[PDB]
Ligand binder design. Structure first.
Ligand SMILES: [Ca+2]
Ligand SMILES: [Ca+2]
Lengths: 65, 143
């Protein structure tokens, strides 16, 4: 039921991680437990991934609505 | 658009484009994600590409990366959809959502963020010790 509920959840979460990522000392970075001591080629990577994640959560939410 | 910005995006694009063919395939992107301790599904890889994919050839050329990197993640009506995403959770109608319900939503539903992230969010949100957030100030935070 209510398929907007996860899409709404997903939309908000991806947008915040997109924004939080611009702070290089946000706790949104400690989430990469398999990456011991992240380097600078990691953040360029994470940052772009996170943008494309926010976009799909934009589409999926539209679809529901 | 800055020459600094394009430069750095060019550097970024090279991080995904390992074979130097100027294309990013759904299998190259999964490499990178899996490098970061992730597991994506063949569809999840196929949904990300299909969002950045204006040529329909299945690949990401550098100009579509640049299109996506320079998109108004804050101006392209980003604030209207993010509003109505919150309004799925104000059944009271008040432009207010309990900080507790927020945590429960940010942590159990959708992408399920870590508690420390949720702690950061609520603190920097409109929680001025009112265990309510007016998401009006939230949507603007991110934009
Ligand atoms: Ca390639
Ligand atoms: Ca392409």
């Amino acid at each position: 039921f209510n398929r907007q509920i996860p899409a709404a959840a997903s939309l908000i979460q991806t947008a915040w991680r997109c924004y939080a990522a611009e702070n290089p000392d946000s706790s949104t970075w400690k989430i990469y437990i398999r990456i011991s001591q992240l380097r600078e080629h990691h953040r360029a990577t994470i940052k772009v991934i996170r943008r494309m994640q926010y976009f799909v959560a934009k589409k999926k939410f539209q679809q529901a609505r | 658009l800055t020459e600094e910005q394009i430069a750095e995006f060019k550097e970024a694009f090279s991080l995904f484009d390992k074979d130097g063919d100027g294309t990013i395939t759904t299998k190259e992107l999964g490499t990178v994600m899996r490098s970061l301790g992730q597991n994506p599904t063949e569809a999840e890889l196929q949904d990300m590409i299909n969002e950045v994919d204006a040529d329909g050839n299945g690949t990401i050329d550098f100009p579509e990366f640049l299109t996506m990197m320079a998109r108004k993640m804050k101006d392209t009506d980003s604030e209207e959809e993010i509003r109505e995403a919150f309004r799925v959770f104000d059944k009271d109608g008040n432009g207010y959502i309990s900080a507790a319900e927020l945590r429960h939503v940010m942590t159990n539903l959708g992408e399920k963020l870590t508690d420390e992230e949720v702690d950061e969010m609520i603190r920097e949100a409109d929680i001025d010790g009112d265990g309510q957030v007016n998401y009006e100030e939230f949507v603007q935070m991110m934009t």
